RNA sequence: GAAUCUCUUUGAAGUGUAGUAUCUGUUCUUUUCAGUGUAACAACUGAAAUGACCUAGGCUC
């Protein structure tokens, strides 16, 4: 029932834990440091975790942290689409514009069950501080994602470009964020996503 | 789980087959079913719930549903007792009940006293003695009055015993006028009868305590004995027997009243009436005054001799009792007995038909043995030689018993060479010719051989010839019988310096040690134990170092006696022969026992633990401790506890300087059960050393630092158990400063509940009272002595009760009492000269 | 007793007589049931001796004892030695459910 | 069961050893036990008895002993008052 | 020393005299709490055990690993308890009226007392 | 007993008495008053205001 995980003793002076909570004290029993509850067997531990008691103490601890100050069914063919970066310019500075093209009714003919099909591609700015390899980092990426196709990134060394100032007249349909509504276009009829 | 459904008694429950009065009404009967028909784990819980809530449920529904259950014929001794236990716990809980339900319960649990087994007799007494305090005198007296008038012999017999248990519980002084009511009642005949029997069971239950109360009862005997009713007259005579035997010679001054009519009853009514009368007078004989004993004994002995021919069983049983008691009389001479009583005794009462019935055979033997004291021993056994050679096997058995009990008391030193020869000859004959399976012959024969020993040598050889002759036989009964006889005869052979003969015995037994039958094999190993114990090891033939490796597989034979005698003998080689067996073989022994002590036997388990002392003396103590500590990690409680015992004994024989440091590391191990085994092993290793722990105390206190502080009530419990022995044996050494610490950690645990925790902590604090002295221990008790909390108070007054029990003068100077503290104070404490 | 709770004691002024225990119970201090360094022989009141009941084991109350019971050195210092007459009057739930369990 | 036995042993120990505070005991009941045991030891030891005899200055020592005995009962104060 | 709950003392004038008598040591205050005297959060972070350094000299620490055969000299062990460790005594112990409350941990006070010693 | 040939291999579970701890599930105030209870709580036991007015409150009716 332990699923082969090693829970170190409390006195062993902390490898990442699944839940950094259940420990074993100086004795052999298992304890929840937050809940301060003793548990005889790992089954009792799982009852504790699945119990509302522990959860309440987790929310209380999160409140203490603030005081101190669809995802499953996601289809994934991991297919790299074709981007068309191009140095743009208007007035009064310089901005970037990307032209991402998508399938020509080649494989999207088998999936049409209004499952987020109406949802257009989405962009987000990610810091390289977190990667599957975690080697080098220190720059941002303008990630672009669509359900079936594979994610795409574009490095942005410049601290700020095209970061405008009240372009439109403050209309509030947040969509996803100010970035997406502010500067993206989704030609859904031709399947072309423009971003600038 | 409701294990083992009862269809008829469950459909008798009805209730829920699928509203507070309906909820208690249902759950109550549901629990009752859990107890009667259910699962052990279930019924154990329903007991605790039923007792905790026993005050909540109305006794009307409790007894209303519960009581009629026991009226059925489909109950079993298991289940009926399962309900009986609830009866006891509930009656002792509520403590107050109305008279109709008192009557119901007394009628239900009343027949229990009559059941054949003292197991049921005991609890049947418990329900009644617990109910007596509940209902009281007046209620129970109002209960027995309508019942004693019943025409049913069975029920009258029942509430005779029940009324007796009540009389003992609430005292016979309060219930005595009732005894005078049914006693002296002129109305009913059965009321007279049972009114007399109640005196019987009162006398039996009180025993010697009947003395101070014997005045009122003898009134009933003297006045009610004169009744013209033969059964009444008989029962009175039995009451004189019981109250005389339980009386002991004191009561003569009171019995002198009823002394007279017994004789005029004897010389007249005769018959079974004279049987009961001579039982009474016979019981009077020991309490008679020496002159009066002289007269009345000589008066009775004539009637006895005349009545030797009584065809009836009861009268013969009585006669044997009267001779049994009259034997102790100094007036009648052993010359008189040998000239008249004894010859007319042995010829009449030793007839073969006598030996057929055991309950008579008892009184025959005990009577004969009481005769042996006054009679010459050589004369008694002289008359006892002919019954030994009779061809009837049970008659030979009784013939043995007489020799056993006689020779144990007197001994055979009175016998001449010739009849001494014929004695051992007869014993060998009956021993080798015995048909029946019984354990007496080798026991009593062994008793004779222990009585006379140096004289045995020329018989000692043929006796052993018969021994080997039976050691080869096709019946395991005769096998283990002869082996048991061997183990008994081994010490005697040493007196004849036959030692080579002991060697050939050791040979043959060692060669037969490979027998399949465990029951015989165990006895064989017992004979091995006696041989090796008696004779020097060097001259032992096999020799020992060849013996033991054949013993190492024996430990796995399971059963019981095999490991009993096996562990005994392995221990014998453990203390006697350290050098012979190789140390690795001793390690195999350690592993085998370490696996072996899972057995359920406390003798096997205890002796098994004891052998580790000898093995620790012979071999490496650390070597033993490795296996022991490695076995502490096992979940089984017997393994943990008795491995802790082994650690204790090893620490006793080796000394704690070796064992303790490794123990402390085994405590450093995080595992709970291991830490518990450590703390208990520390307790035992301390109780086995009185003067040693004094030097070791300081190294203990940092370990008890984490023990007493530990969250687990178990660790706090067993640590307190350490402080018990450690404090008792280290008290007065001067370590009080350490004891002060150890206590300072204990005081907060006083409020801890549970029975085990509370008694371990109480005993610990009492041990601290001896090491610290009351004064400081007092100071804590005082500053907590009263307090508002109603809880703190109840807790500390326990410790102060035990302190007041052990110490009083010791606490006298330490009472924090001043003239402003209390009004009167004591004017004499301030006096200074 | 120290372990089994429901066992009831006597606690009267002990007489000259010495209590007997069976070979099965041999070695136990009748209070604490300890096997170590026994000191003084138990003494029971006359009310616990009289007839056949005198032969019983003062500990297990059933078997007929040969051996004398001794108090340990821990009870002799705790004074429980002199407390009163040790005996077990009630057989106890353990022994009861044992006998009814087997038969 | 266990606590229930502790009640019976409470009755027995209270019977033998007289005053043992159980749970609720009045200060009059308990202080009486204090006085009784203190006087008990003062007269019990020939030592402390000899001591109180001289420090008090009585003509004889048994006067002090039987004084303590009498002083054990409460009414002895009023008894002295009536002399 | 007297506290608000002493008002309901059935014999308050007496209980004040006893509780305020010279050498009496007031009841440990973990009563009136229902936590069974140890719920302590600090109990979670207590060290399993530490050998007294004199016993740690015996080297059985290395011989047997308690953390997640072993034969040693009788003279060595005996001398550790007696020759080396006769005058040895635990460093902390406690005093006349020291009582251990739940939240207390002696170890930090041991390093404290030792530190008031070393550091000047 | 000795001699030869072929082939193969190696190099067990379990019980009962008492008692404890720990999960988890589940429960929860409309307001008062008085009693029990409590160290005080808690808890338990009984009843029930309806109407009007003023800026939590009322010597209110
Ligand atoms: Zn938790
Ligand atoms: Zn007794
Ligand atoms: Zn016994
Ligand atoms: Zn003892």
UniProtKB/Swiss-Prot annotation, chain A:
Annotated GO MF terms: RNA binding; zinc ion binding
GO biological process assignments: mRNA splicing, via spliceosome; spliceosomal complex assembly; U2-type prespliceosome assembly
Gene Ontology cellular component annotations, sorted alphabetically: catalytic step 2 spliceosome; nucleus; Prp19 complex; spliceosomal complex; U2 snRNP; U2-type prespliceosome
Entry keyword annotation includes Mitochondrion: no
UniProt zinc finger (Matrin-type) residues: 30-60
Keyword annotations from UniProtKB, A to Z: Metal-binding, mRNA processing, mRNA splicing, Nucleus, Spliceosome, Zinc, Zinc-finger
Chief location bin: nucleus
Function: mRNA splicing factors, PRP9, PRP11, and PRP21, are necessary for addition of the U2 snRNP to the pre-mRNA in an early step of spliceosome assembly.
Subunit-structure text: Belongs to the CWC complex (or CEF1-associated complex), a spliceosome sub-complex reminiscent of a late-stage spliceosome composed of the U2, U5 and U6 snRNAs and at least BUD13, BUD31, BRR2, CDC40, CEF1, CLF1, CUS1, CWC2, CWC15, CWC21, CWC22, CWC23, CWC24, CWC25, CWC27, ECM2, HSH155, IST3, ISY1, LEA1, MSL1, NTC20, PRP8, PRP9, PRP11, PRP19, PRP21, PRP22, PRP45, PRP46, SLU7, SMB1, SMD1, SMD2, SMD3, SMX2, SMX3, SNT309, SNU114, SPP2, SYF1, SYF2, RSE1 and YJU2. Interacts with CUS2.
Additional information: Present with 3460 molecules/cell in log phase SD medium.
Family recorded in the similarity comment: Belongs to the SF3A2 family.
Protein name: Pre-mRNA-splicing factor PRP11
UniProtKB/Swiss-Prot annotation, chain C:
Keywords tagged on the record: mRNA processing, mRNA splicing, Nucleus, Spliceosome
TM region(s), chain numbering: none
Gene Ontology process terms (BP): mRNA splicing, via spliceosome; response to xenobiotic stimulus; spliceosomal complex assembly; U2-type prespliceosome assembly
The keyword Nucleus is assigned to this record: yes
Pfam entry (one): PHF5
Compartments (UniProt record): Nucleus
Keyword Nucleus: yes
GO CC annotation: nucleus; precatalytic spliceosome; spliceosomal complex; U2 snRNP; U2-type spliceosomal complex
Subunit field text: Component of the spliceosome where it interacts with CUS1, HSH49, HSH155, IST3 and RSE1. Also interacts with YRA1.
Family stated for the protein in its record: Belongs to the PHF5 family.
The protein's role, per its UniProt record: Required for pre-mRNA splicing. Involved in regulation of drug sensitivity and may play a role in multidrug resistance.
Protein name: Pre-mRNA-splicing factor RDS3
Taxonomy of the source species: Eukaryota, Fungi, Dikarya, Ascomycota, Saccharomycotina
Curated annotation (Swiss-Prot), chain D:
Localization, UniProt: Nucleus
Keyword Nucleus part of the UniProt annotation: yes
Keyword annotations: mRNA processing, mRNA splicing, Nucleus
InterPro entries: SF3b5/RDS3-10
GO annotation, cellular component aspect: nucleus; precatalytic spliceosome; spliceosomal complex; U2 snRNP; U2-type spliceosomal complex
GO biological process, one term: spliceosomal complex assembly
Subunit details: Belongs to the SF3b complex composed of CUS1, HSH49, HSH155, RCP1, RDS3 and RSE1.
Biological role: Involved in pre-mRNA splicing. Required for the SF3b integrity and prespliceosome assembly.
Protein name (record): RDS3 complex subunit 10
Species assigned in the record: Saccharomyces cerevisiae (strain ATCC 204508 / S288c)
Source taxonomy: Eukaryota, Fungi, Dikarya, Ascomycota, Saccharomycotina
Gene, per the UniProt record: YSF3
Curated annotation (Swiss-Prot), chain E:
Annotated source species: Saccharomyces cerevisiae (strain ATCC 204508 / S288c)
Protein family: To mammalian SAP 145. Some, to C.elegans ZK632.11.
Subunit structure: Belongs to the CWC complex (or CEF1-associated complex), a spliceosome sub-complex reminiscent of a late-stage spliceosome composed of the U2, U5 and U6 snRNAs and at least BUD13, BUD31, BRR2, CDC40, CEF1, CLF1, CUS1, CWC2, CWC15, CWC21, CWC22, CWC23, CWC24, CWC25, CWC27, ECM2, HSH155, IST3, ISY1, LEA1, MSL1, NTC20, PRP8, PRP9, PRP11, PRP19, PRP21, PRP22, PRP45, PRP46, SLU7, SMB1, SMD1, SMD2, SMD3, SMX2, SMX3, SNT309, SNU114, SPP2, SYF1, SYF2, RSE1 and YJU2. Interacts with RDS3.
Purpose: Essential splicing protein required for U2 snRNP binding to pre-mRNA during spliceosome assembly.
Subcellular location: Nucleus
Protein name per the record: Cold sensitive U2 snRNA suppressor 1
Record note on what altering residue 36 to K does: In allele CUS1-54; cold-sensitive growth suppressor
Note: Present with 1830 molecules/cell in log phase SD medium.
